[PDB]
Amino acid sequence: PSSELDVNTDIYSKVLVTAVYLALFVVGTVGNTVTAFTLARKKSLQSLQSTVHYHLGSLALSDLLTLLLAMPVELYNFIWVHHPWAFGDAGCRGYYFLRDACTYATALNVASLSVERYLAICHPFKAKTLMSRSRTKKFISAIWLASALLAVPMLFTMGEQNRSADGQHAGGLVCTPTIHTATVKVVIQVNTFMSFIFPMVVISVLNTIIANKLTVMVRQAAEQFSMAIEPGRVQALRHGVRVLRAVVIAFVVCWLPYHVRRLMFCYISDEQWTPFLYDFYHYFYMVTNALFYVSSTINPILYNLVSANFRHIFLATLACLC
């Protein structure tokens, strides 16, 4: 037959998964493009600075395009139609190129965002010494072009194969990577470390230092240059410490399992692993890509809805279209 590529999955479970992906796609698309146009009108409303406005725009743009690009194909050809795979050989090579570039965009983008959050407080002179509009534009174009260039290896690695019992079969074409096993181990370790490890270190250490300095100011003005926000010394700084730690735990909890599963595919031996894990792996893929898309949707509300001012303009604009 062709049952070697039969992803044994419960249909009710796959239905529930597809409901979750559909809901996340709706709220992510709507909230992300609403955040984009809200923020662009906030340049037209706050009207004084565009320092990190471009960073948040790039992040919302990344999240929007990764949701709308990756979610259809990752719904159908992976969760639903596992065996035939009907969306094109160079098409699927480009598809893996796209999701790799988008993950890299979001990764290095939230990294550079947090580095800017650090550089604002730690060196209040050096941003005005460097970060002009030109510096920010060149900076985010640099981050974006790096995210484009690092993705090139997956286009050279993620092949396609009619890997059925014969060559010609019913739907035996299945977009698996076609490189050697050492090669895919190298590129998956490269993608994993380069996409997450030093983003984890950079985001974690920088936001940890930011939380430490904020807590030190909270302790120094707990019993009361000067830099004091007296009604928000409890309220605003409490929200600040909460959202800083929240952003890093959100990021860690949301992206650890995904390429953790990639590395599970990588450091996997056929002799070593039985079929029991296999079914758990397909289910784990469902849960993993689910959590990665809620990663793609979570960051906008924590970077706009954390403020009330962006929530003010966002209520003004989400009420405007509807």
Binding site: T176, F265, Y278
Partner: peptide, 6 residues
């Protein structure tokens, strides 16, 4: 069989 999808 090693999961083809990745």
């Amino acid at each position: 069989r090693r999961p083809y999808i990745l």
